[PDB]
Amino acid sequence: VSPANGAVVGVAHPVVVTDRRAVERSIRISTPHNTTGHFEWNVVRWVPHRYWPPHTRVSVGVQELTEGFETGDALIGVASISAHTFTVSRNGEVLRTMPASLGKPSRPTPIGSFHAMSKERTVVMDSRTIGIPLNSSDGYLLTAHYAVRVTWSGVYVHANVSHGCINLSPDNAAWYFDAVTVGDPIEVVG
């Protein structure tokens, strides 16, 4: 079961647990206002309906085991294909509307509602590593700085960008990296 014990995460962070109805029954999310959500699939995860309440203690019961974590500030990022922005708000107020490169017109950033999965100060991205040659237009070999993993499928926040990834200036990517915490909502919309 993840997040780990005591871990202070953001508000889009799902709980991950490693008959489909039968293990669902053996799990329950206990919150101060009994927050509702649903199961999504092995390994099953539970997502809150409109997020977690900020600064709320969450405990997960799964069988004879209970574990609990905390939520911090409500820091929300929204990526607009059409506005060409990444906008980061924290508790209502917006901190930065930042210009962003969201994929490329061939492969723009996939619409969805996600969370920051991890933080890596620099990450090298070689298309050869997943079977894509460098002589391709959708090919690359670069070091990404201040990379925040959006999806399992390879979107990173870190312009002809491939894999759907989100590109910002270094000043803005550094800040978001500073601002963001594991769990924070990243929203891809129009």
UniProtKB/Swiss-Prot annotation:
The gene is ldtA. The active site is at 158 (proton donor/acceptor), 165 (nucleophile). It is found in: Periplasm. It comes from the Bacteria. Substrate binds at residues 140, 153-154, 167. One of its GO terms (molecular function) is acyltransferase activity. Generates 3->3 cross-links in peptidoglycan, catalyzing the cleavage of the mDap(3)-D-Ala(4) bond of a tetrapeptide donor stem and the formation of a bond between the carbonyl of mDap(3) of the donor stem and the side chain of mDap(3) of the acceptor stem. Is specific for donor substrates containing a stem tetrapeptide since it cannot use pentapeptide stems. Is thought to play a role in adaptation to the nonreplicative state of M.tuberculosis. The lineage of its organism: Bacteria, Bacillati, Actinomycetota, Actinomycetes, Mycobacteriales. Is irreversibly inactivated by the beta-lactams carbapenems via the formation of a covalent adduct resulting from acylation of the catalytic Cys; ertapenem and imipenem are the most efficient drugs for in vitro LdtMt1 inactivation. Cephalosporins (cefotaxime, cephalothin, and ceftriaxone) also form covalent adducts with LdtMt1, although the acylation reaction was 7- to 1,000-fold slower and leads to elimination of one of the drug side chains. A high drug concentration (360 uM) of ceftriaxone is required for full inhibition of enzyme activity. Is not inhibited by ampicillin. Pathway: Cell wall biogenesis; peptidoglycan biosynthesis. This is L,D-transpeptidase 1. Consists of two domains connected by a short loop, which form a bent shape. The N-terminal domain (residues 32-122) resembles a c-type immunoglobulin (Ig) domain, and the C-terminal contains the catalytic site that is located in a tiny tunnel.
